[PDB]
Amino acid sequence: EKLFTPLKVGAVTAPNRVFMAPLTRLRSIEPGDIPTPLMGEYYRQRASAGLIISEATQISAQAKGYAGAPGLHSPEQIAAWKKITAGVHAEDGRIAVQLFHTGRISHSSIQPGGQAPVSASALNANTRTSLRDENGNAIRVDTTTPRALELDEIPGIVNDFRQAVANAREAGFDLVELHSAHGYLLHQFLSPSSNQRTDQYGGSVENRARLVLEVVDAVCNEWSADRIGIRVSPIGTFQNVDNGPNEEADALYLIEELAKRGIAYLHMSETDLAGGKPYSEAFRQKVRERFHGVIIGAGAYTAEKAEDLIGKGLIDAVAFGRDYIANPDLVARLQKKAELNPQRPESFYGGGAEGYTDYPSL
Numbered sequence: 001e002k003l004f005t006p007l008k009v010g011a012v013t014a015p016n017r018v019f020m021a022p023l024t025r026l027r028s029i030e031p032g033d034i035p036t037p038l039m040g041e042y043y044r045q046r047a048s049a050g051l052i053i054s055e056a057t058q059i060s061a062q063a064k065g066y067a068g069a070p071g072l073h074s075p076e077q078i079a080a081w082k083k084i085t086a087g088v089h090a091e092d093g094r095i096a097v098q099l100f101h102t103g104r105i106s107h108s109s110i111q112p113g114g115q116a117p118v119s120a121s122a123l124n125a126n127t128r129t130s131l132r133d134e135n136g137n138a139i140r141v142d143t144t145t146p147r148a149l150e151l152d153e154i155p156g157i158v159n160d161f162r163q164a165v166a167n168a169r170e171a172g173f174d175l176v177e178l179h180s181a182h183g184y185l186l187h188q189f190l191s192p193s194s195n196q197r198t199d200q201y202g203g204s205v206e207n208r209a210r211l212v213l214e215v216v217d218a219v220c221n222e223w224s225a226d227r228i229g230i231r232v233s234p235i236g237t238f239q240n241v242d243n244g245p246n247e248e249a250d251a252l253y254l255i256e257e258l259a260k261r262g263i264a265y266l267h268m269s270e271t272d273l274a275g276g277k278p279y280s281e282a283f284r285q286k287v288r289e290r291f292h293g294v295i296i297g298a299g300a301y302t303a304e305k306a307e308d309l310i311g312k313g314l315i316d317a318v319a320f321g322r323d324y325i326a327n328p329d330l331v332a333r334l335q336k337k338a339e340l341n342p343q344r345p346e347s348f349y350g351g352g353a354e355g356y357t358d359y360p361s362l
């Protein structure tokens with residue numbers, strides 16, 4: 001078995017290939033979107049992971065889509081995240097911050113000034129986001145119709161990603177993961193379904209990938225390419241955002257472009273929680289020959305599926321989501337073939353310690 005063997009991931013070395021997937025838990029303080037000591041304890045409990053990838057973290061106030069999600073733009077956010085990374089490092093762990101802009105998956109009530117969120121085009125996402133009620137409890141509310149970004153606003157978006165990566169370095173993160181998946185802003189530009197622009201940021205695949213590649217170049221320049229990962233979900237449909245009528249060819253174009261930058265890793269979210277068609281081994285081979293860094297697979301994996309694909313030389317590591325919510329010591333349990341704690345989905349979002357830090361270790 002290979003799941004418990006080391007792997008060099010850009011600038012750090014993971015001691016195993018069992019990674020903690022990015023998981024939105026909506027427990028941050030408002031006002032201020034500030035990480036908490038309870039969040040610090042949760043991440044410290046999981047520090048035996050080969051790599052922790054944080055919950056989605058907004059790059060700016062405009063980037064916020066969910067009440068209770070943290071940011072990485074203000075002094076108070078930087079100071080709170082510094083305590084969290086210090087606690088992970090005290091336990092000999094490694095942690096990446098997942099950075100996003102939600103684009104049209106948002107609501108006017110949590111935007112600056114109470115105004116419309118932004119996107120590639122002015123089309124409603126036709127889904128829900130998570131807000132908080134008068135008592136601070138999580139609630140699902142229909143998304144607000146966005147306005148299209150003006151051409152002259154695009155450099156500011158690139159600069160916000162650049163600044164958030166500068167802040168992540170100061171906060172003591174080991175790596176950053178750019179959120180280019182799941183129907184958020186970068187994916188909204190990538191997909192023809194959500195991008196009807198007639199300037200240089202819409203139409204062809206080269207134009208649709210222009211924004212995400214500008215962001216990759218900016219953050220590599222700010223820090224170093226060996227500190228940068230990216231999450232993509234380029235095959236299937238995710239939160240009403242499909243990948244267009246040429247999804248395989250368009251995915252291989254983007255992956256070839258990413259490879260030119262020499263980034264640390266490519267993280268593929270293979271399916272939505274509601275399911276989708278499995279990746280073919282032929283498509284996995286085409287990805288593998290186009291990218292020369294670490295490849296992480298995710299989406300309803302078991303340890304058995306992970307071992308199979310790692311042994312075949314097609315991926316290098318696996319990110320587990322819901323098994324990591326329920327099992328702080330998932331590495332030890334998989335190594336010893338011990339039974340897992342049962343999941344409690346009712347407490348995935350919002351609340352406090354219950355369903356968060358109260359899943360026991362062996």
Ligand SMILES: Cc1cc2nc3c(=O)[nH]c(=O)nc-3n(C[C@H](O)[C@H](O)[C@H](O)COP(=O)(O)O)c2cc1C
Pocket residue numbers: 021022023024025054055056098179181182231269298299300301319320321322323348349
């Ligand atoms: C409660 C919950 C929150 C999630 N939040 C995020 C997120 O912040 N960013 C992201 O890229 N994916 C997010 N996902 C997807 C997970 O990263 C992961 O890909 C998925 O849970 C993997 O499948 P598994 O749970 O079957 O292992 C979330 C999933 C769940 C269950």
Ligand SMILES: O=[N+]([O-])c1cc([N+](=O)[O-])c(O)c([N+](=O)[O-])c1
Pocket residue numbers: 024056100179181182273
């Ligand atoms: O649980 N969620 O609300 C949720 C949130 C995010 N996110 O980045 O904010 C995701 O990427 C996914 N996701 O991919 O399933 C889910």
